[PDB]
Amino acid sequence: MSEKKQPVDEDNWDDDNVEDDFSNQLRAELEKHGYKMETS
């Protein structure tokens, strides 16, 4: 404005929530998905 308080101090986002779920969980993932095969 700049008056008063402030001088004192589809889209891809909806799916980017789920991507954030993929970031902290199960990586992507390829390698682990391929490593779980020979474990048992």
Partner 1 sequence: MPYFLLTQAVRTGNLAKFNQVLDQFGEKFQADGTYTLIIRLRHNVIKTGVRMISLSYSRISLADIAQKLQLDSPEDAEFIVAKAIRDGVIEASINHEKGYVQSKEMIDIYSTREPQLAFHQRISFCLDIHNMSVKAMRFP
**Closest approach of partner 1 to the CB of residue 23, in Å:** 8
Which residue number, 12 or 24, has a Cβ lying nearer to partner 1? 24
Q: Write out the binding residues for partner 1, residues 1-40 only, by CB under 8 A.
A: 20, 23-25
Q: Is 23 exposed, middle or buried (0-12, 13-18, 19+ CB in 10 A)?
A: exposed
Report how far residue 7's alpha carbon sits from residue 5's, in angstroms, rounded to the nearest whole number: 6
For the bound state, the minimum distance from the C-beta of residue 22 to partner 1, rounded and expressed in Å, comes to: 12
> Alpha helices of 1-40 — where are they, by DSSP H?
12-23, 31-39
Q: Which residues bind partner 1 (CB under 8 A)?
A: 20, 23-25
